[PDB]
Amino acid sequence: PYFKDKVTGVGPPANEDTREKAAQGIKAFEELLVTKWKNWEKALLRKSVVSDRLQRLLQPKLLKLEYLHQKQSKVSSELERQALEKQGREAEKEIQDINQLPEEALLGNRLDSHDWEKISNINFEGSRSAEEIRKFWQNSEHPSINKQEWSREEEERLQAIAAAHGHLEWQKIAEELGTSRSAFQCLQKFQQHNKALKRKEWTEEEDRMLTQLVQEMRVGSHIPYRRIVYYMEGRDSMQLIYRWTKS
Amino acid sequence: CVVEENDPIFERGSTTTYSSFRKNYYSKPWSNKETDMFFLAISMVGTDFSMIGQLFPHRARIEIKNKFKREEKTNGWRIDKAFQEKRPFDFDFFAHLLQKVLAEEEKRKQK
Amino acid sequence: KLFQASPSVPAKYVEDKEKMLSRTMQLVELANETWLVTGRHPLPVITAATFLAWQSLQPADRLSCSLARFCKLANVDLPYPASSRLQELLAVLLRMAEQLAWLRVLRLDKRSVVKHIGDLLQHRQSLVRSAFRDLLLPPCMLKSPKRICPVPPVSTVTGDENISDSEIEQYLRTPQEVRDFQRAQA
Amino acid sequence: VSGSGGCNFPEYELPELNTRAFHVGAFGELWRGRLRGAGDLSLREPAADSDREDAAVARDLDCSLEAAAELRAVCGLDKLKEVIPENTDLVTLGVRKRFLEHREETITIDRACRQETFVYEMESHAIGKKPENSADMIEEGELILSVNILYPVIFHKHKEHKPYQTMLVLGSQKLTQLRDSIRCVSDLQIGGEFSNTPDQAPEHISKDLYKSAFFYFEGTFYNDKRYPECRDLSRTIIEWSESHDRGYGKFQTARMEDFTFNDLCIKLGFPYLYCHQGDCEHVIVITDIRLVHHDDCLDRTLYPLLIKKHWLWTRKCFVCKMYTARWVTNNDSFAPEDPCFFCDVCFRMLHYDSEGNKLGEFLAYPYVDPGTFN
Amino acid sequence: TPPGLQTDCEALLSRFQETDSVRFEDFTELWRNMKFGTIFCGRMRNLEKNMFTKEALALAWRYFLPPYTFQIRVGALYLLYGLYNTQLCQPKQKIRVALKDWDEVLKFQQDLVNAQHFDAAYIFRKLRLDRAFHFTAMPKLLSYRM
Amino acid sequence: QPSNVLSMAQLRTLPLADQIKILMKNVKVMPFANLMSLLGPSIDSVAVLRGIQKVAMLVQGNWVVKSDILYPKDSSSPHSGVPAEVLCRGRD
């Protein structure tokens, strides 16, 4: 199917309303969409980062070698030719050592400076945004992250560390946990393990609000329990289903 | 008046054009049985291309000359053997073989 | 017409004039120094170089565009050997990538080297030098020419003055063949 | 501008795809003309009975009971087959028994029929409902048009394309009612940055601000002129269409508060456009045109009640995964991802300290989840 | 289209093709021996049964077209009549009709007036008085998304 | 069939948003009452307020056009040639 009835897509003009929508900042649901990452995408990201790092390290050395070649081709002196050749061989040995370095240190630290937009628009063809690539490389594509699941010895510590932090900061929780993991994964596992805050117990006002919802937005017999939860924070799906279905 | 008989062509960009150097010839390749019967015709007639072109309606005389030159340049022993062997000129059986070749090329086109 | 945004060509295909011209000049200089324009028509090589430049200036949106599509968009008669020149130039660029370190680790191809063509032209001198260290000739000659120009056996056997009259008789047309030819050409 | 000259009968143009152009008002007028109606009242029956039908047949062609008295007795229910449908040579009963076995395999009792119950209730909502006022009774023979709408991209392009809701409209009513009845998420969407002031109530939603909206049916541009803040994007559309000889003929422009569904010239099964908020475009597919019936909704006030509503999945809060997200954050260091989503409590407790100060630099916007209408 | 119901309707139409022309005696004999009102409710989901009957009536009226002889046409029309009159679904599903089909059945009524295929105009008139026909432009629903 | 190229009639024939934008770009200083009087009494006060709040700011009870409206992103200083962002910052 197609959604380009009027403007086929060859000359669609950007009108005043369209540019006003683009300039105001109303991003309803289009650009905020997220697509699941793929294995070949991970490999492409790693290869692109390694290639960018190696190129940025070698470009000054290549320029220095070009300068040495220009000096050799322009200087007709023989005494300085020996020094020029020695410096050229030194640069060649430096390049050889750089290439011989294992593929473990050329990836960079967790927080290093790179050109995310350049890497994205060169390799990913713009499909992956620069910020998404930065996040994926900083918290999900590092060899220092502990891929091992929680060995039932992190939740009890985090439920106190994050409580003391008041959930006000991101990196401090992971740093105090000290298990060489990302704060995102830690908080995700902790909040998947724990239960809801259990707002209240059989409140007549909330029961009547739920009855009003079932009278205004319910269709037939199926009940949108997610719609019920949206207007009532502090609940969980299974208990709410088992409770509201009866009495 | 031209009552919408032709259609305008969006060609001949005013900027520039290049050359082609190859316009019309566009020959058609031979086959194994066709080469065999061509060698048979050579042994039966000789090197006179007029008679060969007359007896070959579906292949051009220029193509026949090109094939003969290629054979002379590449396979000399075959030409020598063809000139050694001789066959009296046959007309009815040659026309029958021409019809057989027409049927064979029709079957090839069907395939 | 990829300089000014015209109604037909969208803005995505429109690219800078000076940068694209410089890229095309570098590519054609590379082709001239790598024995690509010698013996062949120059215009197909120029078309291939400008197409590669136009694709490298934005590899993302132009990965699917083809040579015929580019010629149709630009309103230019497509040269026939332009495809072969493009393939040979891409092979040369692949050799340059293999010479480079990060590209040879990346293991690019004739479709993914377009994004790094610009990097290939940054230090193309040493790359071409090394490539020649490890001549460009037609594909029909680089097929392992073991026996180059085989020596023909010298045959200067002349006899005394001739051979015999049997060959003369076998060359002469028989009366039967004469009558058959006369009947055929009557 | 007069309508396109064409016969009222919808002659086909493509096999099982769509018909040719035709008018709607004349269609309904001829539909009401070729019959008497007077049956959309549900007054069949809740004594002398034979004489009334005798007089009726006396006006009819046969004026006799010879055939009547026998066929009325033949066509009864006491001679009609609860009981298990078996012990008879049948064809579809094999498929029925196979379906029963497949149900007994995995399907448990009578449920998991979410869309089925949805359709059942949405069809029963329009069964025999009377208007509040006596002047709102729908007259007999009113045109009822079924119109599918395809606004969103967030659905399955794989599953034979079931993207969005279907509406019913009345011919005599105005197109502005349909325009206001279309429940678009972009209308509820709100623009503006509220990171420094999260407690500020979002005011001037896109529905109030971007009042520009226009329909497009067969080259006719209906632009809404009810409000003094409505622009005219059809101006730029016509400028583009006329700036070059692209094969598009001249297009007519009209007002949306002066042309009703009757005056339209449409093709059933042909896609038309409804564009508002600049780029928010809906593909409009008018599929069926039918008359009013006593079993349908007889109240003119509430007829645009949908016959179909597509289920949509709400975006859950990325932190707790227990509540639906209400805020979208970009360039947020504390957020795990770039296109991130948070609910009220999680956003407050993460992006703000114990006093409410903005912890860290980020860009937060009110995330109006698409699942807001249902 | 409903596959099994299509086969059932075709079999019933063949049987009507071998029966008398329009005599209701053979229709009663068919309702007795095979009971073409085979199944309406059974035991199935409410909407599944509703759509089953809806597709049955829609396909039956779609098959009810001009070309056939006086046996096939009458058989299809009165199969529809029986399915509507024995409606075991709580809503009385209206038979789907086309626009020009109304003029077609008007011409059929005119033919019956200038003919003597008795009891046919009677059953059709009873069906009309029952308020069963709901007319559209297509015998089914069509879109562009498929 | 300067920025003041459009006349009063050509201005009034444009939508309210464009009318307010052009008036602000031309005058750059005008009270809300004066804007209402120039636009006409038949236009709603809430509509005019919505139109002016997007292209003007409140300064001591008066309305002053925004800097970006006068200096587009592609414009520059006619006297020094500095980018329009610096001019907007200075005007703010």
PDB file of N, CA and C in Angstrom, chain E residues 27-92:
ATOM      1  N   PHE E  27     -39.460 -27.750  -3.924  1.00  0.00           N
ATOM      2  CA  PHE E  27     -38.738 -27.033  -2.875  1.00  0.00           C
ATOM      3  C   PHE E  27     -39.037 -27.624  -1.501  1.00  0.00           C
ATOM      4  N   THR E  28     -40.302 -27.962  -1.242  1.00  0.00           N
ATOM      5  CA  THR E  28     -40.650 -28.632   0.007  1.00  0.00           C
ATOM      6  C   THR E  28     -39.999 -30.007   0.092  1.00  0.00           C
ATOM      7  N   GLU E  29     -39.973 -30.739  -1.023  1.00  0.00           N
ATOM      8  CA  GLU E  29     -39.319 -32.043  -1.038  1.00  0.00           C
ATOM      9  C   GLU E  29     -37.833 -31.917  -0.720  1.00  0.00           C
ATOM     10  N   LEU E  30     -37.184 -30.875  -1.244  1.00  0.00           N
ATOM     11  CA  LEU E  30     -35.775 -30.636  -0.942  1.00  0.00           C
ATOM     12  C   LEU E  30     -35.577 -30.271   0.524  1.00  0.00           C
ATOM     13  N   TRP E  31     -36.426 -29.385   1.051  1.00  0.00           N
ATOM     14  CA  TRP E  31     -36.340 -29.028   2.464  1.00  0.00           C
ATOM     15  C   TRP E  31     -36.588 -30.238   3.356  1.00  0.00           C
ATOM     16  N   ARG E  32     -37.317 -31.232   2.850  1.00  0.00           N
ATOM     17  CA  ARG E  32     -37.574 -32.446   3.615  1.00  0.00           C
ATOM     18  C   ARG E  32     -36.397 -33.417   3.548  1.00  0.00           C
ATOM     19  N   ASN E  33     -35.883 -33.677   2.341  1.00  0.00           N
ATOM     20  CA  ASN E  33     -34.890 -34.735   2.176  1.00  0.00           C
ATOM     21  C   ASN E  33     -33.492 -34.276   2.579  1.00  0.00           C
ATOM     22  N   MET E  34     -33.069 -33.100   2.112  1.00  0.00           N
ATOM     23  CA  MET E  34     -31.729 -32.605   2.396  1.00  0.00           C
ATOM     24  C   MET E  34     -31.695 -31.469   3.406  1.00  0.00           C
ATOM     25  N   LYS E  35     -32.785 -30.712   3.550  1.00  0.00           N
ATOM     26  CA  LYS E  35     -32.885 -29.632   4.533  1.00  0.00           C
ATOM     27  C   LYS E  35     -31.780 -28.593   4.312  1.00  0.00           C
ATOM     28  N   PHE E  36     -31.902 -27.891   3.178  1.00  0.00           N
ATOM     29  CA  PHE E  36     -30.856 -26.963   2.757  1.00  0.00           C
ATOM     30  C   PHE E  36     -30.591 -25.873   3.788  1.00  0.00           C
ATOM     31  N   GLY E  37     -31.534 -25.611   4.687  1.00  0.00           N
ATOM     32  CA  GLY E  37     -31.219 -24.841   5.873  1.00  0.00           C
ATOM     33  C   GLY E  37     -30.451 -25.704   6.852  1.00  0.00           C
ATOM     34  N   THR E  38     -29.209 -26.043   6.498  1.00  0.00           N
ATOM     35  CA  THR E  38     -28.477 -27.084   7.213  1.00  0.00           C
ATOM     36  C   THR E  38     -28.106 -26.643   8.624  1.00  0.00           C
ATOM     37  N   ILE E  39     -27.323 -25.576   8.742  1.00  0.00           N
ATOM     38  CA  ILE E  39     -26.775 -25.158  10.027  1.00  0.00           C
ATOM     39  C   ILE E  39     -26.811 -23.638  10.122  1.00  0.00           C
ATOM     40  N   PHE E  40     -27.250 -23.135  11.270  1.00  0.00           N
ATOM     41  CA  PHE E  40     -27.253 -21.699  11.533  1.00  0.00           C
ATOM     42  C   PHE E  40     -26.510 -21.318  12.803  1.00  0.00           C
ATOM     43  N   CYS E  41     -26.687 -22.074  13.884  1.00  0.00           N
ATOM     44  CA  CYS E  41     -26.085 -21.749  15.170  1.00  0.00           C
ATOM     45  C   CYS E  41     -25.040 -22.759  15.612  1.00  0.00           C
ATOM     46  N   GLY E  42     -25.413 -24.031  15.719  1.00  0.00           N
ATOM     47  CA  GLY E  42     -24.509 -25.044  16.224  1.00  0.00           C
ATOM     48  C   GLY E  42     -23.963 -24.680  17.592  1.00  0.00           C
ATOM     49  N   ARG E  43     -22.640 -24.542  17.682  1.00  0.00           N
ATOM     50  CA  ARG E  43     -22.010 -24.021  18.897  1.00  0.00           C
ATOM     51  C   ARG E  43     -20.686 -23.379  18.479  1.00  0.00           C
ATOM     52  N   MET E  44     -20.678 -22.052  18.400  1.00  0.00           N
ATOM     53  CA  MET E  44     -19.521 -21.320  17.904  1.00  0.00           C
ATOM     54  C   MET E  44     -19.593 -19.899  18.447  1.00  0.00           C
ATOM     55  N   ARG E  45     -18.468 -19.187  18.349  1.00  0.00           N
ATOM     56  CA  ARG E  45     -18.406 -17.799  18.783  1.00  0.00           C
ATOM     57  C   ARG E  45     -19.489 -16.978  18.096  1.00  0.00           C
ATOM     58  N   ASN E  46     -19.999 -15.977  18.818  1.00  0.00           N
ATOM     59  CA  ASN E  46     -21.131 -15.199  18.323  1.00  0.00           C
ATOM     60  C   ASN E  46     -20.789 -14.488  17.017  1.00  0.00           C
ATOM     61  N   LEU E  47     -19.658 -13.779  16.986  1.00  0.00           N
ATOM     62  CA  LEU E  47     -19.283 -13.068  15.769  1.00  0.00           C
ATOM     63  C   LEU E  47     -18.900 -14.026  14.650  1.00  0.00           C
ATOM     64  N   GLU E  48     -18.305 -15.174  14.983  1.00  0.00           N
ATOM     65  CA  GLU E  48     -17.985 -16.155  13.952  1.00  0.00           C
ATOM     66  C   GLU E  48     -19.253 -16.655  13.267  1.00  0.00           C
ATOM     67  N   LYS E  49     -20.285 -16.968  14.054  1.00  0.00           N
ATOM     68  CA  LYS E  49     -21.571 -17.365  13.487  1.00  0.00           C
ATOM     69  C   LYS E  49     -22.202 -16.226  12.687  1.00  0.00           C
ATOM     70  N   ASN E  50     -22.104 -14.999  13.203  1.00  0.00           N
ATOM     71  CA  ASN E  50     -22.672 -13.846  12.511  1.00  0.00           C
ATOM     72  C   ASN E  50     -22.036 -13.663  11.138  1.00  0.00           C
ATOM     73  N   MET E  51     -20.702 -13.703  11.079  1.00  0.00           N
ATOM     74  CA  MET E  51     -20.006 -13.559   9.806  1.00  0.00           C
ATOM     75  C   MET E  51     -20.228 -14.763   8.903  1.00  0.00           C
ATOM     76  N   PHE E  52     -20.394 -15.954   9.484  1.00  0.00           N
ATOM     77  CA  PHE E  52     -20.755 -17.132   8.704  1.00  0.00           C
ATOM     78  C   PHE E  52     -22.055 -16.897   7.943  1.00  0.00           C
ATOM     79  N   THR E  53     -23.098 -16.475   8.662  1.00  0.00           N
ATOM     80  CA  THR E  53     -24.383 -16.212   8.018  1.00  0.00           C
ATOM     81  C   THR E  53     -24.285 -15.044   7.041  1.00  0.00           C
ATOM     82  N   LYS E  54     -23.504 -14.018   7.393  1.00  0.00           N
ATOM     83  CA  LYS E  54     -23.345 -12.860   6.521  1.00  0.00           C
ATOM     84  C   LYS E  54     -22.727 -13.261   5.187  1.00  0.00           C
ATOM     85  N   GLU E  55     -21.639 -14.034   5.233  1.00  0.00           N
ATOM     86  CA  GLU E  55     -21.000 -14.497   4.006  1.00  0.00           C
ATOM     87  C   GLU E  55     -21.917 -15.432   3.230  1.00  0.00           C
ATOM     88  N   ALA E  56     -22.681 -16.271   3.937  1.00  0.00           N
ATOM     89  CA  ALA E  56     -23.644 -17.139   3.269  1.00  0.00           C
ATOM     90  C   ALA E  56     -24.622 -16.324   2.432  1.00  0.00           C
ATOM     91  N   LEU E  57     -25.259 -15.334   3.061  1.00  0.00           N
ATOM     92  CA  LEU E  57     -26.250 -14.526   2.358  1.00  0.00           C
ATOM     93  C   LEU E  57     -25.610 -13.717   1.235  1.00  0.00           C
ATOM     94  N   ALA E  58     -24.422 -13.157   1.482  1.00  0.00           N
ATOM     95  CA  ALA E  58     -23.757 -12.346   0.468  1.00  0.00           C
ATOM     96  C   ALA E  58     -23.421 -13.174  -0.765  1.00  0.00           C
ATOM     97  N   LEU E  59     -22.819 -14.349  -0.566  1.00  0.00           N
ATOM     98  CA  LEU E  59     -22.475 -15.201  -1.699  1.00  0.00           C
ATOM     99  C   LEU E  59     -23.722 -15.703  -2.413  1.00  0.00           C
ATOM    100  N   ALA E  60     -24.778 -16.020  -1.658  1.00  0.00           N
ATOM    101  CA  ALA E  60     -26.003 -16.509  -2.279  1.00  0.00           C
ATOM    102  C   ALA E  60     -26.638 -15.438  -3.161  1.00  0.00           C
ATOM    103  N   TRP E  61     -26.662 -14.185  -2.689  1.00  0.00           N
ATOM    104  CA  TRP E  61     -27.217 -13.124  -3.525  1.00  0.00           C
ATOM    105  C   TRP E  61     -26.301 -12.787  -4.693  1.00  0.00           C
ATOM    106  N   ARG E  62     -24.982 -12.901  -4.507  1.00  0.00           N
ATOM    107  CA  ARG E  62     -24.067 -12.687  -5.622  1.00  0.00           C
ATOM    108  C   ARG E  62     -24.291 -13.726  -6.713  1.00  0.00           C
ATOM    109  N   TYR E  63     -24.523 -14.982  -6.321  1.00  0.00           N
ATOM    110  CA  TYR E  63     -24.847 -16.015  -7.297  1.00  0.00           C
ATOM    111  C   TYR E  63     -26.188 -15.752  -7.969  1.00  0.00           C
ATOM    112  N   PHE E  64     -27.096 -15.056  -7.284  1.00  0.00           N
ATOM    113  CA  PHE E  64     -28.424 -14.739  -7.813  1.00  0.00           C
ATOM    114  C   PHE E  64     -28.282 -13.617  -8.841  1.00  0.00           C
ATOM    115  N   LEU E  65     -27.944 -14.008 -10.071  1.00  0.00           N
ATOM    116  CA  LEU E  65     -27.723 -13.073 -11.169  1.00  0.00           C
ATOM    117  C   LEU E  65     -28.623 -13.429 -12.351  1.00  0.00           C
ATOM    118  N   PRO E  66     -28.763 -12.544 -13.337  1.00  0.00           N
ATOM    119  CA  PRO E  66     -29.726 -12.762 -14.440  1.00  0.00           C
ATOM    120  C   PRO E  66     -29.526 -14.059 -15.216  1.00  0.00           C
ATOM    121  N   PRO E  67     -28.290 -14.459 -15.567  1.00  0.00           N
ATOM    122  CA  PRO E  67     -28.145 -15.376 -16.726  1.00  0.00           C
ATOM    123  C   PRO E  67     -28.869 -16.705 -16.635  1.00  0.00           C
ATOM    124  N   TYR E  68     -29.025 -17.293 -15.446  1.00  0.00           N
ATOM    125  CA  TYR E  68     -29.394 -18.702 -15.360  1.00  0.00           C
ATOM    126  C   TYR E  68     -30.865 -18.927 -15.718  1.00  0.00           C
ATOM    127  N   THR E  69     -31.203 -20.223 -15.877  1.00  0.00           N
ATOM    128  CA  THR E  69     -32.559 -20.643 -16.213  1.00  0.00           C
ATOM    129  C   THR E  69     -33.518 -20.384 -15.059  1.00  0.00           C
ATOM    130  N   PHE E  70     -34.802 -20.683 -15.264  1.00  0.00           N
ATOM    131  CA  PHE E  70     -35.799 -20.466 -14.221  1.00  0.00           C
ATOM    132  C   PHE E  70     -35.611 -21.384 -13.023  1.00  0.00           C
ATOM    133  N   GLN E  71     -34.780 -22.423 -13.134  1.00  0.00           N
ATOM    134  CA  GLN E  71     -34.546 -23.306 -11.999  1.00  0.00           C
ATOM    135  C   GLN E  71     -33.467 -22.753 -11.077  1.00  0.00           C
ATOM    136  N   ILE E  72     -32.301 -22.415 -11.634  1.00  0.00           N
ATOM    137  CA  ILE E  72     -31.170 -21.974 -10.817  1.00  0.00           C
ATOM    138  C   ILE E  72     -31.488 -20.658 -10.115  1.00  0.00           C
ATOM    139  N   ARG E  73     -32.076 -19.706 -10.848  1.00  0.00           N
ATOM    140  CA  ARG E  73     -32.369 -18.396 -10.269  1.00  0.00           C
ATOM    141  C   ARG E  73     -33.356 -18.515  -9.117  1.00  0.00           C
ATOM    142  N   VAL E  74     -34.452 -19.242  -9.338  1.00  0.00           N
ATOM    143  CA  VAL E  74     -35.459 -19.413  -8.297  1.00  0.00           C
ATOM    144  C   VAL E  74     -34.874 -20.168  -7.112  1.00  0.00           C
ATOM    145  N   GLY E  75     -34.037 -21.173  -7.382  1.00  0.00           N
ATOM    146  CA  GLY E  75     -33.409 -21.905  -6.299  1.00  0.00           C
ATOM    147  C   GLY E  75     -32.530 -21.027  -5.431  1.00  0.00           C
ATOM    148  N   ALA E  76     -31.694 -20.198  -6.058  1.00  0.00           N
ATOM    149  CA  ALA E  76     -30.836 -19.298  -5.292  1.00  0.00           C
ATOM    150  C   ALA E  76     -31.663 -18.290  -4.499  1.00  0.00           C
ATOM    151  N   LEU E  77     -32.658 -17.681  -5.151  1.00  0.00           N
ATOM    152  CA  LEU E  77     -33.466 -16.665  -4.484  1.00  0.00           C
ATOM    153  C   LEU E  77     -34.205 -17.245  -3.286  1.00  0.00           C
ATOM    154  N   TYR E  78     -34.752 -18.448  -3.421  1.00  0.00           N
ATOM    155  CA  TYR E  78     -35.532 -18.996  -2.322  1.00  0.00           C
ATOM    156  C   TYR E  78     -34.680 -19.738  -1.303  1.00  0.00           C
ATOM    157  N   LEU E  79     -33.453 -20.122  -1.657  1.00  0.00           N
ATOM    158  CA  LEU E  79     -32.476 -20.472  -0.635  1.00  0.00           C
ATOM    159  C   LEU E  79     -32.182 -19.267   0.245  1.00  0.00           C
ATOM    160  N   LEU E  80     -32.016 -18.095  -0.372  1.00  0.00           N
ATOM    161  CA  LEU E  80     -31.862 -16.866   0.403  1.00  0.00           C
ATOM    162  C   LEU E  80     -33.093 -16.601   1.261  1.00  0.00           C
ATOM    163  N   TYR E  81     -34.278 -16.798   0.684  1.00  0.00           N
ATOM    164  CA  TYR E  81     -35.519 -16.592   1.424  1.00  0.00           C
ATOM    165  C   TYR E  81     -35.583 -17.496   2.652  1.00  0.00           C
ATOM    166  N   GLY E  82     -35.251 -18.778   2.480  1.00  0.00           N
ATOM    167  CA  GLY E  82     -35.274 -19.701   3.604  1.00  0.00           C
ATOM    168  C   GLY E  82     -34.229 -19.376   4.653  1.00  0.00           C
ATOM    169  N   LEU E  83     -33.021 -19.009   4.216  1.00  0.00           N
ATOM    170  CA  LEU E  83     -31.975 -18.641   5.164  1.00  0.00           C
ATOM    171  C   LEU E  83     -32.359 -17.403   5.963  1.00  0.00           C
ATOM    172  N   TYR E  84     -33.050 -16.449   5.336  1.00  0.00           N
ATOM    173  CA  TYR E  84     -33.476 -15.254   6.057  1.00  0.00           C
ATOM    174  C   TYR E  84     -34.653 -15.536   6.985  1.00  0.00           C
ATOM    175  N   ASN E  85     -35.611 -16.355   6.542  1.00  0.00           N
ATOM    176  CA  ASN E  85     -36.802 -16.611   7.346  1.00  0.00           C
ATOM    177  C   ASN E  85     -36.519 -17.530   8.526  1.00  0.00           C
ATOM    178  N   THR E  86     -35.518 -18.403   8.412  1.00  0.00           N
ATOM    179  CA  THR E  86     -35.101 -19.271   9.506  1.00  0.00           C
ATOM    180  C   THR E  86     -33.904 -18.706  10.255  1.00  0.00           C
ATOM    181  N   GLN E  87     -33.804 -17.378  10.339  1.00  0.00           N
ATOM    182  CA  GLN E  87     -32.656 -16.720  10.950  1.00  0.00           C
ATOM    183  C   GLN E  87     -32.541 -17.084  12.423  1.00  0.00           C
ATOM    184  N   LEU E  88     -31.541 -17.893  12.770  1.00  0.00           N
ATOM    185  CA  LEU E  88     -31.284 -18.259  14.156  1.00  0.00           C
ATOM    186  C   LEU E  88     -30.244 -17.368  14.817  1.00  0.00           C
ATOM    187  N   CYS E  89     -29.603 -16.484  14.060  1.00  0.00           N
ATOM    188  CA  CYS E  89     -28.760 -15.457  14.647  1.00  0.00           C
ATOM    189  C   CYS E  89     -29.639 -14.349  15.217  1.00  0.00           C
ATOM    190  N   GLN E  90     -29.223 -13.805  16.362  1.00  0.00           N
ATOM    191  CA  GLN E  90     -30.046 -12.792  17.022  1.00  0.00           C
ATOM    192  C   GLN E  90     -30.294 -11.576  16.135  1.00  0.00           C
ATOM    193  N   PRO E  91     -29.298 -10.980  15.480  1.00  0.00           N
ATOM    194  CA  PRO E  91     -29.606 -10.000  14.440  1.00  0.00           C
ATOM    195  C   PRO E  91     -30.064 -10.695  13.170  1.00  0.00           C
ATOM    196  N   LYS E  92     -31.057 -10.093  12.518  1.00  0.00           N
ATOM    197  CA  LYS E  92     -31.571 -10.612  11.255  1.00  0.00           C
ATOM    198  C   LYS E  92     -30.703 -10.036  10.147  1.00  0.00           C
TER     199      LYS E  92
END
